[PDB]
Amino acid sequence: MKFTVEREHLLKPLQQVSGPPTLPILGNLLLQVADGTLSLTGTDLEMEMVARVALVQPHEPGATTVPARKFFDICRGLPEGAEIAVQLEGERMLVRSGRSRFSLSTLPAADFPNLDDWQSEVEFTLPQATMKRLIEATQFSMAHQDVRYYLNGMLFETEGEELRTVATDGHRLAVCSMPIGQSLPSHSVIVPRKGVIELMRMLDGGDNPLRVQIGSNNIRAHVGDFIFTSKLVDGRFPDYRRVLPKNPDKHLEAGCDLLKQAFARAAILSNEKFRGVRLYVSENQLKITANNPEQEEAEEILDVTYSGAEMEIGFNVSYVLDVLNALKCENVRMMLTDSVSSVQIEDAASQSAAYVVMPM
Amino acid sequence: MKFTVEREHLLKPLQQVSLPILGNLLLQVADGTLSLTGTDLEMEMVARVALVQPHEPGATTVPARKFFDICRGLPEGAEIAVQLEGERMLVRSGRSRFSLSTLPAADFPNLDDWQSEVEFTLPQATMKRLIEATQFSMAHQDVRYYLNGMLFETEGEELRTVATDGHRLAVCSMPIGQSLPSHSVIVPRKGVIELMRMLDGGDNPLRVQIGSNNIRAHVGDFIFTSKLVDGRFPDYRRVLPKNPDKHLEAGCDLLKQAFARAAILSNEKFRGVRLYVSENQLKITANNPEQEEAEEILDVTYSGAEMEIGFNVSYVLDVLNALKCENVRMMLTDSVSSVQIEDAASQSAAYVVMPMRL
Ligand SMILES: O=C(O)[C@@H]1CCc2c([nH]c3ccc(Cl)cc23)C1
Ligand SMILES: O=C(O)[C@@H]1CCc2c([nH]c3ccc(Cl)cc23)C1
Ligand SMILES: [Ca+2]
Ligand SMILES: [Ca+2]
Ligand SMILES: [Ca+2]
Ligand SMILES: [Ca+2]
Ligand SMILES: [Cl-]
């Protein structure tokens, strides 16, 4: 196995396959030269990233595996415009560039683990920006290491011509739907949180569309010369329609950033553990208050657009702040029911995403 | 106690000054001025804010982080009105209102009174240069408490800083245009850190006052006071190589990148790399317990006898990152002697690294 490639053609592929073990070979990248292509594979047994690099210079076929981080750190450490000559010699991989020479240990390619083979049941294409939008709008609401394993991940749902993401930790929910202009079956799967992070990581910028394949136990995303494959999560994800308030007809509208800074200041004097704040809504006005065990108190009063009846309601302020930070918009709509029911929150200008927060 | 001040006039003082009372700030309105004091019993920062708006005298202490966070959270340009109300401190700005707990100003601890024995003034930029050049070589929580800080030494018209962790050494000296007594003190590392951040590098001169057990630095509206480390510092002069007659000179960044690349395949604990020096050429090699190997060859300026020497690559990279210059000189003797490292174009800072037998 031999190849010579430009540093700049190696960097991003290495970065993509490198991110991230007790089982050593999982710390290695599989390198394959075949049919004028270098393939770079990294895996953790649950998910897999494969990058393909075209070889325009002389090369020889073969396969090996090398320490991922070390190989990446060596390539990144080399100067702008460096040319990187690699060859398998003995049980070592030789890396040469200029007068820099490196000899890395290898583990046999035959030892590199493969995911189980599977069949694609559902397929579609969508813009990179759309997938980015879907993930960023909901990602923050996924659970972290909850015993309900199905919540430590993100639902991806196809319905009509819409792709939808749902994330919830049992206390708050985020949902976002986008048109992708294809007739899709009605289907949903849960992608593990690590898979979601990796999927987000591969976009990227630029105008490369994303190709998605969904199997009974796997998801695959093709973008450019990268292929990401993940296992799915078992379990019955909650139905976002049961979480959305059935009729939240008390509509409050306020500047997103003004609203956020008011909640953030009030948050300073909220209970450090429970983070509770009270909202007092009345005609065109919102009052936010907070207090802690040591009798410290915050009060914020804002002008808002509100014509409904007056009500009081308590919330975990971090949850509200999460939502407002996730809304990169000018105005927010808060949709209320009563003092003991959840609130729906949306961008005043768009219904594409919805956020639900339970009262305290 | 009562005052009304613009948010932005509080932010820098608050940043600078930031038992539970040690988590509070002492606030004092007196003679047209707001004073804010923070302390951890070892050191203290006092900031002064001129009060152009109507005010009423008094003193209290409030939670530092909360009060800072409230002020920083309010909108740019906001006016912040503060008054005492029983056991509480009221903070108002627009339609935002905050009631904070207080602890008595009488309970706020003071550093012991002391006499200034040695004094000098120097540009802030000079003090910043002195500390930056050496700071990274201070020990962290070493049993030898006298190394967990930085030596400040006066001699003739020069101020010198020394820092060592018992393994490598940094030294920096600058003339300051004033005749000084021959003296030296050890400033605790947290004190060094605080002093550093008190300096904007600007046009306000820095006044330093040193007592038998304390040091004080005054810059414009800020006064920093710290206890000294009461111990003996090692003599730096004994560690400098007697007569290093083998000077290698090379571009700092190229030298650094070569070492940083070779370091990847060096021992993770002991970080030894080898140098082979020959006429106008340097070869760096590294290997680890897995027998992975790195080699770097680069052009340098060198005309001395051919030699080989090993160093901790982490220590050398620290030096090269601190130097931030165009060209570096490595002053070599032999394989069993330490190396002195300097900016090729300045003797003001010098760094010593021990030899390694690899
Ligand atoms: O499977 C579960 O335990 C559900 C997870 C999602 C969820 C449950 N109760 C909720 C109440 C409010 C919100 Cl926002 C989400 C949930 C229960
Ligand atoms: O008091 C001590 O223990 C000394 C601290 C300074 C020091 C010791 N051995 C060293 C070796 C190299 C350098 Cl640069 C400093 C020291 C021992
Ligand atoms: Ca209703
Ligand atoms: Ca509260
Ligand atoms: Ca002296
Ligand atoms: Ca070595
Ligand atoms: Cl080699």
Side-chain angles (χ1 to χ4, degrees), chain A residues 1-45 47-360, chain B residues 1-75 77-157 159-189 191-325 327-358:
Chain A
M1 184 197 83
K2 304 209 209 302
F3 65 87
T4 307
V5 288
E6 297 274 84
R7 173 171 175 271
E8 12 300 315
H9 295 135
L10 260 192
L11 282 180
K12 178 161 141 52
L14 282 177
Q15 175 175 313
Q16 283 298 124
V17 301
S18 282
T22 191
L23 200 271
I25 206 158
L26 294 184
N28 278 18
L29 299 177
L30 173 68
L31 299 195
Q32 299 166 123
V33 180
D35 287 347
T37 297
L38 173 66
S39 290
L40 303 87
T41 301
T43 187
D44 71 2
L45 301 167
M47 65 189 166
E48 186 192 88
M49 182 71 80
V50 189
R52 286 182 62 159
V53 172
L55 304 172
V56 297
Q57 294 190 52
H59 53 273
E60 294 162 17
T64 194
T65 82
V66 281
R69 194 97 268 124
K70 290 178 191 173
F71 186 48
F72 178 56
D73 289 344
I74 290 161
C75 292
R76 189 171 43 100
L78 289 167
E80 167 91 280
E83 172 162 292
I84 308 168
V86 173
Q87 68 176 230
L88 190 65
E89 192 169 319
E91 225 146 29
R92 312 265 98 175
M93 193 175 89
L94 274 36
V95 178
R96 295 176 297 140
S97 187
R99 288 188 289 180
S100 311
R101 295 169 59 89
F102 306 88
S103 183
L104 296 165
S105 63
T106 61
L107 288 171
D111 295 350
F112 200 86
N114 273 169
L115 298 169
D116 282 3
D117 217 319
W118 54 281
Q119 308 304 146
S120 182
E121 298 306 332
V122 183
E123 270 172 38
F124 54 90
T125 301
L126 70 157
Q128 233 179 246
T130 308
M131 185 63 75
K132 178 191 157 73
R133 163 71 175 150
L134 287 163
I135 299 169
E136 251 169 22
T138 60
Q139 176 163 206
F140 73 93
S141 290
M142 297 185 294
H144 307 266
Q145 298 283 90
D146 192 292
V147 290
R148 298 109 105 207
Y149 57 100
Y150 52 85
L151 298 185
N152 310 316
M154 173 176 295
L155 190 74
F156 280 73
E157 174 169 31
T158 54
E159 197 187 19
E161 296 190 13
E162 280 192 339
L163 178 59
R164 179 177 300 122
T165 49
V166 189
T168 185
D169 59 13
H171 310 288
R172 37 84 180 277
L173 175 138
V175 60
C176 181
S177 301
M178 300 289 286
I180 62 163
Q182 286 177 55
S183 177
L184 307 160
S186 282
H187 196 246
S188 62
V189 294
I190 315 167
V191 172
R193 60 168 304 117
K194 283 195 167 80
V196 173
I197 292 163
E198 282 311 313
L199 173 52
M200 187 55 160
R201 203 156 153 274
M202 73 196 311
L203 347 148
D204 175 35
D207 275 305
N208 283 328
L210 185 62
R211 182 70 178 185
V212 181
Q213 295 174 296
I214 298 176
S216 76
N217 294 126
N218 299 92
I219 187 171
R220 169 169 290 174
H222 307 256
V223 49
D225 299 296
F226 293 94
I227 305 182
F228 172 69
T229 305
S230 177
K231 286 166 154 190
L232 300 174
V233 181
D234 285 327
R236 275 131 31 79
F237 206 83
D239 175 11
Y240 75 98
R241 301 166 310 175
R242 297 284 132 177
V243 182
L244 291 178
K246 63 172 170 183
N247 186 207
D249 68 9
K250 295 174 180 60
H251 296 337
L252 176 156
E253 277 143 78
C256 185
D257 296 347
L258 265 190
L259 197 58
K260 179 210 292 181
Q261 283 186 206
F263 276 118
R265 283 189 306 272
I268 302 160
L269 301 176
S270 70
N271 186 278
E272 301 183 344
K273 187 167 178 284
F274 301 113
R275 313 232 77 216
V277 295
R278 300 212 114 291
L279 287 73
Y280 297 85
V281 319
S282 65
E283 184 78 3
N284 298 310
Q285 182 160 282
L286 171 64
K287 185 209 280 170
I288 303 159
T289 65
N291 56 254
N292 55 30
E294 48 222 24
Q295 326 288 261
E296 296 181 319
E297 317 174 70
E299 166 183 296
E300 298 277 344
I301 296 167
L302 307 81
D303 291 345
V304 304
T305 301
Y306 187 77
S307 264
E310 299 183 0
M311 59 162 294
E312 186 181 315
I313 188 160
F315 288 114
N316 175 314
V317 72
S318 297
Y319 293 158
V320 176
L321 284 168
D322 285 349
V323 171
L324 297 173
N325 283 310
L327 295 168
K328 256 71 192 75
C329 63
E330 293 301 306
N331 296 302
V332 56
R333 179 178 300 106
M334 287 191 48
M335 301 146 73
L336 293 158
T337 299
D338 55 43
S339 73
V340 294
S341 314
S342 281
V343 61
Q344 187 166 332
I345 301 166
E346 294 167 7
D347 179 349
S350 180
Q351 289 187 71
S352 285
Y355 301 89
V356 175
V357 186
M358 288 289 270
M360 280 190 52
Chain B
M1 182 194 78
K2 209 164 288 168
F3 65 89
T4 300
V5 191
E6 283 171 53
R7 172 187 177 262
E8 288 69 37
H9 298 162
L10 287 173
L11 296 172
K12 281 156 200 282
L14 279 172
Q15 184 77 245
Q16 290 299 144
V17 297
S18 290
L19 312 184
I21 203 159
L22 303 185
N24 283 21
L25 294 176
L26 171 65
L27 306 184
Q28 298 165 125
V29 171
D31 290 1
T33 296
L34 169 71
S35 288
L36 312 86
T37 314
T39 193
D40 69 358
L41 299 171
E42 294 307 281
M43 67 201 56
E44 150 193 290
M45 180 72 67
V46 182
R48 289 166 219 294
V49 184
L51 301 173
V52 300
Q53 288 187 52
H55 50 274
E56 288 164 17
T60 193
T61 78
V62 290
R65 192 52 171 149
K66 295 180 209 187
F67 179 56
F68 191 12
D69 286 347
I70 287 163
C71 292
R72 187 178 47 99
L74 288 160
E79 289 267 50
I80 309 182
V82 172
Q83 67 175 34
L84 266 168
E85 245 264 328
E87 307 282 6
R88 305 291 144 178
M89 194 182 88
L90 266 44
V91 176
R92 298 189 296 277
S93 190
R95 293 203 79 164
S96 312
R97 300 162 78 258
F98 308 89
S99 177
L100 294 160
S101 59
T102 68
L103 293 167
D107 296 351
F108 199 89
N110 283 303
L111 296 194
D112 296 331
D113 205 58
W114 57 278
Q115 314 298 146
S116 168
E117 299 297 349
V118 12
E119 306 184 342
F120 52 88
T121 301
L122 73 169
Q124 293 180 56
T126 299
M127 185 65 82
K128 196 167 95 67
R129 166 84 166 110
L130 288 156
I131 297 168
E132 269 172 355
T134 59
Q135 194 174 356
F136 75 90
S137 292
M138 301 190 291
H140 310 256
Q141 287 156 55
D142 191 310
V143 294
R144 301 111 94 204
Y145 65 96
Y146 50 87
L147 301 178
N148 303 326
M150 176 179 291
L151 188 78
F152 281 73
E153 183 191 328
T154 51
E155 202 191 41
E157 293 174 30
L159 178 54
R160 172 169 39 254
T161 59
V162 188
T164 182
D165 54 6
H167 302 296
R168 35 80 185 277
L169 177 134
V171 43
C172 191
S173 315
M174 300 285 275
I176 66 165
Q178 305 150 84
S179 184
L180 314 154
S182 291
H183 191 60
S184 76
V185 297
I186 303 172
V187 178
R189 55 168 292 112
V192 170
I193 288 165
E194 197 159 313
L195 170 56
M196 193 54 174
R197 75 145 149 89
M198 189 189 54
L199 305 170
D200 58 47
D203 296 353
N204 287 147
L206 163 69
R207 186 70 163 172
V208 183
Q209 294 175 114
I210 298 171
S212 78
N213 305 98
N214 300 92
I215 180 171
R216 180 170 277 173
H218 307 78
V219 196
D221 290 326
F222 304 92
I223 300 178
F224 171 73
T225 313
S226 175
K227 291 184 186 158
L228 302 165
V229 182
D230 183 18
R232 278 191 202 256
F233 203 81
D235 185 9
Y236 78 89
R237 300 153 184 87
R238 296 184 61 80
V239 153
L240 306 166
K242 223 205 106 303
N243 222 117
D245 72 323
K246 298 167 198 206
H247 290 215
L248 175 144
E249 297 179 37
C252 184
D253 194 66
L254 282 169
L255 203 50
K256 184 209 285 186
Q257 303 316 324
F259 277 125
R261 284 190 303 271
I264 300 160
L265 302 189
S266 78
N267 186 286
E268 290 184 23
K269 280 209 82 214
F270 298 100
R271 300 278 284 175
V273 301
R274 256 153 128 164
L275 275 68
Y276 300 86
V277 205
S278 61
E279 190 171 61
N280 296 326
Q281 187 147 111
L282 166 60
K283 180 162 71 177
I284 302 158
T285 73
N287 49 76
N288 59 23
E290 312 101 279
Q291 300 291 291
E292 296 171 326
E293 294 176 297
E295 180 192 288
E296 295 280 350
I297 303 168
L298 58 160
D299 300 334
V300 301
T301 302
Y302 182 85
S303 58
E306 291 186 354
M307 58 168 281
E308 150 208 316
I309 188 163
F311 305 127
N312 184 302
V313 74
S314 286
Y315 294 163
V316 178
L317 287 165
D318 290 345
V319 172
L320 296 183
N321 283 308
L323 286 176
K324 276 198 276 292
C325 54
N327 295 111
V328 171
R329 86 167 62 249
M330 293 190 62
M331 306 159 67
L332 304 163
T333 297
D334 49 45
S335 63
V336 288
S337 307
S338 65
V339 59
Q340 190 167 143
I341 310 170
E342 287 180 7
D343 180 331
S346 180
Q347 285 175 210
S348 70
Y351 303 88
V352 189
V353 169
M354 289 310 109
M356 282 182 72
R357 190 66 177 100
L358 296 165

